[PDB]
């Protein structure tokens, strides 16, 4: 004598892929401008008593959206800015040997060129400094900007800030964000401690490679996460439970020149350096780094065997963007040599850095950005919160296993902070039998 009854408002959800709308708590900050919707002053996390749920960070749709949207914002930021097409001319360059430390001779060049002025008929002589990474030789003194043979270069508007600011992703009505609270969750499988939130915590959109900067720490113990721990074709994301402080700088005291590239437009040129020329570099505490690696190794031993002979080595060859550590400090673009961090086998550190002004903001090509010069001296301090590593393939049963740092899609940085979140949709109609009939 049971009859079908229908209940509307049943607390049941199914996995879903929907658009998230972005919110957050300067005025020229691109992220702050876009995610301008204010957040909940006091978000309410609701613990779900006796709910078990499965999470999979490697297929997390939230990561894919963060990737798509951040790329779009960079394009929107540059969309209204001045093009540098008029500067793609033959350059007449000299060596710049005045007050240069011997170890960096050749990094800077001093080039002159014929630029148009605001009136179309008149021309002007312009002098500007460049890095050797941006300027390429034609066929002794004649050079061109590297992208003259591939793409238009758009300079960034000098007022725009690209400083990472925490961003919170919120569910649209009908959806909810579930999160794991379990410690030591390795990314693929059920978690027992599950809460529901309206928005994620604030995630800073930090763009970097090899070493993840300014993220969260792994509670009380190092967590090694990978899609497949025995597949050398997959990347390993290592989250540290301690931060490592790194001090980076560009010591040269710079000046900015601004010239009349065209009506209503200005081009930003690097002017004479006020003082001596020295290399950009980063400081890593030596003892701290040695302890950090030992901790990572302990966790690798658990996955690969207690024989624990493990070797670290430098990055593979390839393009500058993948082989060196990359970051944006003070608005400047740095590429740093990390071989000094991966020189031990288990059983202060100064990293030299180079500066580049013409930037491919993402792995795609055909568009490029010009980074205007920043005056003064740039120095910043940041936290290393995790690493991206690849286990080398090769002969099996090696007594010594090998790991090397490396890059990959930007998606992988975002997978770290978002590893604990999932989006589901609420489906309110439930049907069950009972004793009630009309």
Ligand X SMILES: *[C@@H]1O[C@H](CO)[C@@H](O[C@@H]2O[C@H](CO)[C@@H](O[C@@H]3O[C@H](CO[C@H]4O[C@H](CO)[C@@H](O)[C@H](O)[C@@H]4O)[C@@H](O)[C@H](O[C@H]4O[C@H](CO)[C@@H](O)[C@H](O)[C@@H]4O)[C@@H]3O)[C@H](O)[C@H]2NC(C)=O)[C@H](O)[C@H]1NC(C)=O
Ligand Y SMILES: *[C@@H]1O[C@H](CO)[C@@H](O[C@@H]2O[C@H](CO)[C@@H](O[C@@H]3O[C@H](CO[C@H]4O[C@H](CO[C@H]5O[C@H](CO)[C@@H](O)[C@H](O)[C@@H]5O)[C@@H](O)[C@H](O[C@H]5O[C@H](CO)[C@@H](O)[C@H](O)[C@@H]5O)[C@@H]4O)[C@@H](O)[C@H](O[C@H]4O[C@H](CO)[C@@H](O)[C@H](O)[C@@H]4O[C@H]4O[C@H](CO)[C@@H](O)[C@H](O)[C@@H]4O[C@H]4O[C@H](CO)[C@@H](O)[C@H](O)[C@@H]4O)[C@@H]3O)[C@H](O)[C@H]2NC(C)=O)[C@H](O)[C@H]1NC(C)=O
Nearest residue to 205 via CA among 37, 75, 70 = 70
Tell me the closest approach of the beta carbon of residue 121 to a second copy, in angstroms. 5
Q: What residues does 345 pair with on adjacent strands?
A: 311
Pairing between β-strand 349-355 and β-strand 135-137 as defined by DSSP bridges:
unpaired
Residue 318 region by backbone torsions, left for phi larger than 0, else alpha for psi between -120 and 50, else beta:
left
Structure tokens at 184: 């030591």
> Is position 139 an interface residue for a second copy (rule: CB under 8 A)?
no
Figure out which of the listed residues 24, 209, 382, 390 binds ligand Y, where binding follows CB under 6 A.
Answer: 382
Closest residue to ligand Y in the complex (CB): 381
Q: What 3-state class would DSSP assign to 234? A: coil
Tell me the closest approach of the beta carbon of residue 149 to a second copy, in angstroms. 5
- Cβ proximity of 194 and 53 under 8 Å: yes
Figure out which of the listed residues 110, 200, 208, 226 binds ligand NAG, where binding follows CB under 6 A.
Answer: 226
Figure out which of the listed residues 29, 31, 44, 191 binds another protein, where binding follows CB under 8 A.
Answer: 44
Q: What 3-state class would DSSP assign to 413? A: helix
Residue length, the chain? 438
> Is position 176 an interface residue for ligand Y (rule: CB under 6 A)?
no
Q: Sketch the per residue contact string, 358 through 377, with ligand Y: x for CB under 6 A, - otherwise.
A: ----------------xxx-
Tell me the closest approach of the beta carbon of residue 326 to ligand Y, in angstroms. 10
Residue 178 or 206: which CB sits closer to ligand X?
206
> Is position 173 an interface residue for ligand NAG (rule: CB under 6 A)?
no
Tell me the closest approach of the beta carbon of residue 207 to ligand Y, in angstroms. 8
d(CA 138, CA 227): 46
Q: What 3-state class would DSSP assign to 393? A: coil
Could you write out the DSSP letters of every residue in 159-174?
T-B-----BEEEPPTT
Residue 271 touches which member of a second copy, ligand Y, ligand X, none, C-beta under 5-8 Å by kind: none
Question: Side-chain half-sphere of 344: how many Cα atoms within 13 Å?
Answer: 14
Nearest residue to 216 via CA among 45, 417, 55 = 417
> Is position 75 an interface residue for a second copy (rule: CB under 8 A)?
no
Binding-residue total with another protein (CB under 8 A): 51
> Is position 388 an interface residue for ligand NAG (rule: CB under 6 A)?
no
- Cβ proximity of 174 and 426 under 8 Å: yes
Residue 60 or 390: which CB sits closer to another protein?
60
Other C-beta atoms lying within 10 Å of the C-beta of residue 184:
10
Q: Cα 304 vs. chain centroid, distance in angstroms?
A: 29
Residue 182 touches which member of ligand NAG, another protein, a second copy, none, C-beta under 5-8 Å by kind: ligand NAG
Structure tokens at 9: 């408002």
Residue 49 touches which member of ligand NAG, ligand X, another protein, none, C-beta under 5-8 Å by kind: another protein
Tell me the closest approach of the beta carbon of residue 289 to ligand NAG, in angstroms. 9
Which residues are near ligand NAG by CB under 6 A?
95, 97, 105-106, 140, 182-183, 185-189, 192-193, 226, 228-231, 287, 290-291, 294, 344, 346
Which residues are near another protein by CB under 8 A?
1-13, 17-19, 21-22, 33-34, 36-38, 44, 46, 48-51, 72-73, 76, 172-174, 176, 196, 198, 426-438
């Amino acid at each position: 004598n049971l009859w079908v009854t229908v209940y509307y408002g049943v607390p049941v959800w199914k996995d879903a892929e929907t658009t998230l709308f972005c919110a957050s708590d300067k005025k020229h900050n691109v992220w702050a401008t876009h995610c301008c919707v204010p957040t909940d002053p006091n978000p309410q996390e609701i613990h779900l008593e006796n709910v078990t749920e499965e999470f999979n960070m490697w297929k997390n749709n939230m990561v894919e959206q963060m990737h798509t949207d951040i790329i779009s914002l960079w394009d929107q930021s540059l969309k209204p800015c001045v093009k540098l097409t008029p500067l793609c001319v033959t350059l007449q360059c000299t060596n710049v040997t005045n007050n240069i430390t011997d170890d960096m001779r050749g990094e800077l060049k001093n080039c002159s060129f014929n630029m148009t002025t605001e009136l179309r008929d008149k021309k002007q002589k312009v002098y500007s400094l460049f890095y050797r990474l941006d300027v390429v030789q034609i066929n002794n003194k004649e050079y061109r900007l590297i992208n003259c043979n591939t793409s238009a270069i758009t300079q960034a508007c000098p007022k725009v800030s690209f400083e990472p600011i925490p961003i919170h992703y919120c569910a649209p009505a009908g959806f909810a964000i579930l999160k794991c609270k379990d410690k030591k969750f390795n990314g693929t499988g059920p978690c027992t401690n599950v809460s529901t939130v309206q928005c994620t915590h604030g995630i800073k959109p930090v763009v970097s490679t090899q070493l993840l900067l300014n993220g969260s720490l792994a509670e009380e113990e190092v967590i090694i996460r990978s899609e497949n721990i025995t597949n050398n074709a997959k990347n390993i994301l290592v989250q540290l439970n301690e931060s490592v402080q790194i001090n980076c700088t560009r010591p040269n005291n710079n000046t900015r020149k601004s010239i009349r590239i065209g009506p209503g437009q200005w081009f930003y040129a690097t002017g004479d350096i006020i003082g001596d020329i020295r290399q950009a570099h980063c400081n890593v505490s030596k003892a701290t780094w040695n302890e950090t690696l030992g901790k990572v190794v302990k966790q690798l031993r658990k996955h690969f065997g207690n024989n624990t002979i493990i070797r670290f080595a430098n990055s593979s060859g390839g393009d500058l963007e993948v082989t060196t550590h990359s970051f944006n400090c003070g608005g400047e673009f740095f590429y740093c040599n990390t071989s000094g961090l991966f020189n031990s086998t288990w059983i202060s550190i100064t990293l030299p850095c180079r500066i580049k002004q013409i930037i491919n903001m993402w792995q795609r090509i055909g568009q490029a950005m010009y980074a205007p010069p920043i005056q003064g001296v740039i120095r910043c301090v940041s936290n290393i919160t995790g690493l991206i590593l690849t286990r080398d393939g090769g002969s099996t049963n090696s007594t010594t296993e090998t790991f090397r740092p490396g890059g990959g899609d930007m998606r992988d940085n975002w997978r770290s902070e978002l590893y604990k979140y999932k989006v589901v949709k609420i489906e309110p109609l439930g049907v069950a039998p009972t004793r009630c009939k009309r």
